[model samples]
Target chain A: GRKKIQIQRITDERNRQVTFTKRKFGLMKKAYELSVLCDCEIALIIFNHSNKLFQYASTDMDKVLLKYTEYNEPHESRTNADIIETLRKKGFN
Target chain B: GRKKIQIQRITDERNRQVTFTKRKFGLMKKAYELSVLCDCEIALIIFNHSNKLFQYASTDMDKVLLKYTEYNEPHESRTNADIIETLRKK
Candidate 1:
């Protein structure tokens, strides 16, 4: 069984490494579960102490990231109809 | 208590919604723990079923992502000295 761990900075190197390895795997599993269960797009990236990279995506990573960018910025998320309406209002089309 | 759930595609909509909410939080918490404990850079992005976005970063996400890109490509991870040495050798 997993022991209770307080959410604070861990200073011990060995313990930290062990915890990182365990939690990293756990986190990835959780992300995968959420993606499959919810049928949602997901993208995750992590760099370890040595700067090693690990990542996961439910679909194409680029597509998921593009969707995230669009979600973050309304202008980026604008549809073709929105652009057309804007042009019409501005008498440009 | 949490029960064992098989790692398969979830077909039920309501169950999926609840699991998404629960697991998203769990993942973020674990990521946060790992980052703090190990002093590592981490960035996570998620788009839920409704296309809602959620994100977390141990530091500035751009910085973390830049480091990730550098990590992925050895050329990007090279230092100025590396480039200069290559030039001298050439």
Candidate 2:
């Protein structure tokens, strides 16, 4: 019988960093596809073991990141089009 | 000659919602794996065309979200273990 490896945390710095880059790439690539396929915006944030900041924003990168500022604000009255218009003025397609 | 579909904004709400749900699931699954594999923290935030909020955080779910409160703040002095300790106490 073959034994299976469990999901142990990568204890080695080098290996864990590689996993970080790999997974971050995977998530960002998915975000790009989803952004185009669904025509939406996505922001992915990561704080690594080094406490370094890494992030990804869909098309109109800075525009999307800026939009995060209003995340906690109420949007119940706004429609998707409304947000789209705001972004367009900010230079988003 | 048949022209293939281009990347257009999903015009129909029904189909768009399906796409939204599908993509959200994909991103969240990736977040989970990276969090464990790297022994780190991650937060994914999405705002659909409808301005709705969707998000995912790694282990100790609430702890991860709360950590975002300090996202814009500097972390130059802290290590991942320091953040973990904060979560442990919180």
Candidate 3:
């Protein structure tokens, strides 16, 4: 007979929590390594079964997102018409 | 000769534009280096006096922004009764 790996959720809350702790460390370390080698940014969020929170980011993630928008949506940076209209209203053009 | 600070705008627009381009490129290169060495995500935005914009990001900044929202508003992390209660109220 072949040996089988155990499957499904561990029912013992203590054991489950211990598992969570160990895995959380592994996940965090992997995140650090990925960011370092890839020349990219990383954001990680983990919510325990209880809905408690954990997250990590190298920078203000929002600012990065806005920068992304600026890159992808170049038109959103400024509508030429809007700029001209605003300047006209302000008597600057 | 020692470098001296010059105040006010350069009288020549062409000269001012050339200087602006050089300085902006320098700043962007340094920012990229910092982000790479430190595992940082950098968001950089620059607007010249004429209001032309230049920007760069090492990652999808929108996702970063979304992640930031997730971080700052810890209550958003809730998947329990609170989320449903607020949603039902809406």
The TM-scores of all predictions, comma-separated, are 0.67, 0.60, 0.37
State the lDDT of candidate 3 residue by residue for A1-93, as single tens digits.
155524345567786776666554444443333233222343444445564555443334444334445554342222223333444676422
In candidate 3, the residue pairs with backbone N, CA or C atoms under 3 Å apart (3 or more residues apart, or in different chains) clash, namely A61-B64, A61-B65, A62-B65, A64-B61, A65-B61, A65-B62
What is the per-candidate TM-score for chain B?
0.66, 0.56, 0.60
Give a tens-digit lDDT track for model 2, residues B31-80: 66676778767766667876666666564435544565556765323222
Highest TM-score among the candidates is held by which one? 1
Deviation in angstroms for A73 in model 3?
Answer: 7.7
TM-score of chain A of 1: 0.64
What does candidate 1's lDDT look like per residue over A1-93, in tens digits? 468777667888788888876676566656666776676676777777778776766656778667765664432222223333444676422
The best-first sequence of candidates by DockQ reads 1, 2, 3
Candidates, ranked, TM-score: 1, 2, 3
Clashing pairs in 1: none
Q: Label model 2 with its docking quality class.
A: acceptable
- Chain B of candidate 1 achieves a TM-score of 0.66
The list of candidate 1 runs beyond 4 A from truth reads: A1-3, A72-93, B72-90
Pairs that collide in candidate 2 are: A80-B49
Model 3: runs farther than 4 Å from truth?
A1-93, B7-11, B68-90
Candidate 1 global Cα RMSD: 15.7
RMSD of each: 15.7, 14.0, 20.1
Measured on C-alpha atoms, candidate 2 has an lDDT of: 0.62
